[PDB]
Amino acid sequence: QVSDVGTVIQVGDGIARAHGLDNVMSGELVEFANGVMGMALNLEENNVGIVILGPYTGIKEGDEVRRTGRIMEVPVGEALIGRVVNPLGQPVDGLGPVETTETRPIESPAPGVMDRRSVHEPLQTGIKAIDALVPIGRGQRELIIGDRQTGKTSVAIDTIINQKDQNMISIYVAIGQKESTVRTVVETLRKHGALDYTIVVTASASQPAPLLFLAPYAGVAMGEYFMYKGKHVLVVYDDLSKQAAAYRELSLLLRRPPGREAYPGDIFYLHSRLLERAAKLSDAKGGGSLTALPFVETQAGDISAYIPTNVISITDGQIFLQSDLFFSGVRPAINAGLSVSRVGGAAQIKAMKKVAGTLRLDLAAYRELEAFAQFGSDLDKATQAKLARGARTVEVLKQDLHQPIPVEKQVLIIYALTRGFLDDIPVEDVRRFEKEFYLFLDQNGQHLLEHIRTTKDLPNEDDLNKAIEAFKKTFVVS
Amino acid sequence: RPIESPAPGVMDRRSVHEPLQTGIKAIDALVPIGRGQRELIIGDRQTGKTSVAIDTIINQKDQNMISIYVAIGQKESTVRTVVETLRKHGALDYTIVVTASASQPAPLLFLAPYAGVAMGEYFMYKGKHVLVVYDDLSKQAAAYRELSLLLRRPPGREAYPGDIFYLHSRLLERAAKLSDAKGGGSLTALPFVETQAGDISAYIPTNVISITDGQIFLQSDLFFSGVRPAINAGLSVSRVGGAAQIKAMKK
Amino acid sequence: MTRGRVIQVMGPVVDVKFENGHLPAIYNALKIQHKARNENEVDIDLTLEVALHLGDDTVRTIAMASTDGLIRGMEVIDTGAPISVPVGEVTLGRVFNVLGEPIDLEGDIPADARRDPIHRPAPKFEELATEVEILETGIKVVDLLAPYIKGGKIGLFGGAGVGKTVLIQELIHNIAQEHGGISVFAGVGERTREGNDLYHEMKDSGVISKTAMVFGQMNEPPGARMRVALTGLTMAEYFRDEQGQDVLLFIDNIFRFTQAGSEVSALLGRMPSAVGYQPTLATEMGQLQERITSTAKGSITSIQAIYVPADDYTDPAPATTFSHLDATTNLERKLAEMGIYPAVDPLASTSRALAPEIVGEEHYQVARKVQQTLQRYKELQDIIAILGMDELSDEDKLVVHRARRIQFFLSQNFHVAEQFTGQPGSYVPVKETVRGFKEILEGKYDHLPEDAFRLVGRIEEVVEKAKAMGV
Amino acid sequence: MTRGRVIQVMGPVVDVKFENGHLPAIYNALKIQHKARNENEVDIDLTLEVALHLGDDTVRTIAMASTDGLIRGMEVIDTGAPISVPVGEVTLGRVFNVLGEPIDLEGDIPADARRDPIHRPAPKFEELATEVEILETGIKVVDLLAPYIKGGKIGLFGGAGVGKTVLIQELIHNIAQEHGGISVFAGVGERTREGNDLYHEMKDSGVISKTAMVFGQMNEPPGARMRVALTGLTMAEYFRDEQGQDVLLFIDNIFRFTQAGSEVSALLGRMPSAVGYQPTLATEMGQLQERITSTAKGSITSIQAIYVPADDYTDPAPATTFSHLDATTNLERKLAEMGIYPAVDPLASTSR
Ligand SMILES: O=P([O-])([O-])O
């Protein structure tokens, strides 16, 4: 019988060849006698190429392969929230099976030109520097790029944690990471209570390249189900370089001619097909949204490399982190020169727009004046005043991990900094001053906070200044 | 005896503690060489590398040594002149010469060093001390590459086969200092490597450096100035050095 | 019979075997229409294009869409003609896909509409025209150092994240609103958000009443990405061939065409080229480029954007397209990082219209002097970086002093950037910018700070900016 | 059946043909024993490892020793399992090769001892510890400036004449005295005289009584040189799996592993990679680095030395190795000359 049964001819390096399967179709799923799943790529005249999605040590020549009748699919449902699964959708945490009643294909067309809408809603990350200089809107694609030892995972963890009080669903995808690190991340997420609205998809570094290759697609397929029902979803990719390397290895194993840096010509399409699925739907389609935050790793801080340029030429912006600044104890070591947001700005609330310009100008002036600080400070007092303001702004912009700050408190503290109330305060006491100011605002600035939350606009400057001075009266200069 | 034999075991060796005298002040003072140690000499074309080997062969007249000279890819007239000057200095009482000119087929060039080490091992295992000098290894590597390419084997970096490192290590791992139970014999080797335009980043030089215990550099500019030998002390190193010197020289 | 069967499926490539003596010709179109027989099949509707003849009544084709669900042994129908796209007055104000099917949700096109084949030979030698005249854009750098030509070819070279979209939008805003002709836009291999924004902007401005658009954007397969440009060109040619009206054309990114060709050529059985490209890179691009020309019946002006991979100007794809253009502008990341916009390289850009008998003696002299001063300033960087400005002579100090002012004055502010900065922007005439540059070269404004020359527009605003600053 | 005979011999690559329906699985071990029948034959004792299934009842293998003297038609038998290495208390204070046979002149291990396979999947997600704890070493500089993490990987940078062996011996002694654990040393492709000197330095210091040693010589085939780390790791895993105690593991050099893998890939004939390496470099490194973890009843930590060829830190092999490290220690010849021991640089060393 050749209709739905076949036999294996060659096995090696995770690639197998079978004889038979006359009625099989391209992209279908197949199952071996050992229980391992496979995918059919090439339909030749006498044989079919099969990619093994698992351990290939148990497959020998002469085994039996049978059809399944379904295109590559993953199980999707509401019960998947709070679980840890592999790219195939099987539970890994060991808390029992997962029951679902719907499935979605891995490959699906993107929304058309007429089905989209302009981004007009903000997304709060809880980080002062990002929320002030590089705003991010719902439906935007933003790239985070930097070298190793820059703490890129901490930003993702904080922005996932900060979404507790807002109607958002988060999905975390780990590609080529360490299982101990994934376990610690899951443990701290559970400790902070973020497991109620998050899904974790993992793919260890010891897994085969085909398994390393489908995790982002599985994540997008899982997210589209919530996206198309009128909700808002957030998706984070841990690293695309690992996926690119896995695809390069698979293509080399298939004996295809390589191009620049031994990469195939399909590498740009591979990322474009994935990143093109994030969009903001129009009102006629329910008004859903989906946003992605891909990560890219560079070598020696070189931004003009092949993969970084390919990723940059797709997204709507980038954020650059500097290891030299990170070594000085600053956690958000954001470079203000190479980081630009295009879609953003139109999504910011009215409070931040009135205050961001002067902060940006002061930061730029301080950064450009830093080049002459070796023998400076002896010039005019007008130039000398820039150094103190820049140092105070730099001290203000610092933050502690796992401690998001509300947007109203950020607006108030940045307004206080920009209005010059901190010119008579020593540099070393800024953090304690801002902590005590937050406590005082919580104790007494309740009406101002409520007005800000309700109107998205600044309160009256007279009352704001009198409250600031009243707090400043009781502060100890130390 | 066959040309392919296993190397001595890890438990049949003894630490090097006996010096070898070459008669060159710079080598004897800065980069000492001990019996049982094998060391690399690297340099350009016009550096006079053959003179060092000739002098160190001549200097062993009254030290109870046996010397073997292997010529790979050299000119027959040069080999004839070397033999004539060795006869004039009386070094043929304890030396053996193996030759393979450039007009000979590739397999002889590929097989000469194994014949040399096979000849040396017989005297090594009887409790004596032997010195073996290889004229060139790059030419042997090129001949092996030519043979492998003609035999239609998959190529690697710079069209070399996948086992050139194995080929070199198998030959270079047969020099050792035996223990008291085995007889106490010893064998030392002085392979040569020739570079183009003074680079040391090439595949074969890197492979040889990763195996040897040190190297001696010869400077083309210093040779052009007129210094003989043109030994560069800034890059030469001897890992075994210090333990292979007399007390007076050490002080 | 004129029906075949599917033999092999290899992704975007499908093999079809026909009956002997009835093989279809090259560049024909084939149709596949199948309905599921049971629960283990999916409905399929797909089209193919003939590429090669393999012998033994076998044909090698290329698919125009996703090939998932195909089964060996399916039936294939031959149409006997290449892809046909409707053309005429109907196409104005509509949006079309690769196959000419509207996607604007405004209805269907009647089946009696006239349509034309896509593939056609190039115009002959004796039908060409070589008249040269200057087209004004309103940008200082372009108007001074590399004037555009009405009826020629203009190309823009730039890397990733350098500011090409802003420049092309500014050009569209400045030129398209007063052309008084017919405009055609192609969106080959670019973002969908940009296309949606452009469509909404055209709808708001009302210019959409005399334009047509074919997108075939980034997410589409290489089969469609290789044909969007040809569809746009065959739409554009009809107006100037049958009515003699002036046509203005845009191409979003021409590099993606060659990239898709290279992606497809691997599976066809051809040997790789030097950098993995297809062996037929030159002729494939030449066939398309030679089809866009101005004849005695009408004139066509086109603006094209070209992508530079990994900021390498020696790549074969950017290198082989330099011989087809008349005026070129180059963008540099080094200039972009310094805060200079639109960051056009003043020395690399060239144009065929920069002649004394075409522009003017004064303009030619001013441009030559500016280029000479810029080059001389460039020659001193090695000494300046190490030994500083102290060791220079009196002439070199003045040369640097004026070169910095010229370089800062070369910048400009655009209307599009108002929504991000609040500055209205400006429009600068050729005479005004020439007079300003001549006055700067004469040394009249040596006492002003250099920071007053940034994003200022006309020369007169420099003085008011300086006095506002406090000088 | 489990019997076949050779059809092709070329270098370290040997092809064996079996009967249909009885092909051995991948990574299995094969044995060849033969005695000369006439004066025109040579006795042969060799071992092979299965690598690929070429179809038509043919299997391509890689040799672990010299292949001289092989004759087409010589019979081959199948063991039915991968390489097995003895484990337990009998391995303390002994020296073994890649095949597990003792090298010391002190007899051989009895054939009834327990043996374990070399290849094994990584531990599952459920068995990993959920908390991070610090391993105490008793050295002030390490304990204050660069703390060690249980189950982590530490990279050591240094050179000859600084005290690397002394530091290793001190670490082994302190761990054995305080935590009651043991140590395993594995040398991948290093100098025989240096190995002998290190063995004697361990023997005359009294530390050898609580350690096991595995050696891979330079004159061995790349297939033999590629499995020394695996056999050392599978020796080490037994103590934490059964006894439940902390264990130290030492790797003399990690660059030799990658270069041997590249040579094996070139011999098999796969298409090269970016800088000429093997396509499977990342997964080959991961399959080895993922088995050194901390479980709910034990942990293994490793100290590794890196070469960083050509003084380039963007080289793909160092780039891939650096993605698994958790701490870094440096040795300073200036401090060694000044007289401060162990001459660990207090500013260059960093820890997560
Ligand atoms: O940034 P882009 O738009 O690509 O120039």
Numbering used by the authors:
A (entry chain B): 24 to 501
B (entry chain A): 127 to 377
C (entry chain F): 1 to 471
D (entry chain E): 1 to 352
The article reads:
F0F1 consists of a hydrophilic F1 domain responsible for ATP hydrolysis or synthesis and a hydrophobic F0 domain housing proton translocation across the membranes. ATP hydrolysis/synthesis in F1 is coupled to proton flow in F0 through the rotation of a common shaft. F0F1 from the thermophilic bacteria Geobacillus stearothermophilus is one of the best characterized ATP synthases because of its structural stability and simple subunit structure (α3β3γ1ε1δ1a1b2c10).
First, we prepared a cryo grid of nucleotide-depleted wt-F0F1 (ND-wt-F0F1) in the absence or presence of 4 mM ATPγS. We reconstructed three rotational states (state 1: 3.1 Å, state 2: 3.0 Å, and state 3: 3.7 Å resolutions) from the single-particle images of ND-wt-F0F1. In the structure of ND-wt-F0F1, the C-terminal helix of the ε subunit (ε-CT) also adopts the up form and penetrates the cavity of the α3β3 cylinder. In contrast to the previous structure of wt-F0F1 (12), no nucleotide density was observed at the noncatalytic nucleotide-binding site in the three α subunits or the catalytic site in βTP. Instead, a density likely corresponding to a phosphate was observed at the catalytic site of βTP. This phosphate was possibly derived from the phosphate buffer used for nucleotide depletion. Therefore, the structure indicates that the closed structure of βTP is stabilized by the penetration of ε-CT into the cavity between αDP and βTP, which is independent of nucleotide binding to βTP. In other words, the penetration of extended ε-CT into the α3β3 cavity does not result in the open conformation of βDP but rather forces open βTP without bound nucleotides to the closed conformation. The structures of nucleotide-depleted F0F1 indicate that the ε subunit directly forces βTP to adopt a closed form independent of the nucleotide binding to βTP.
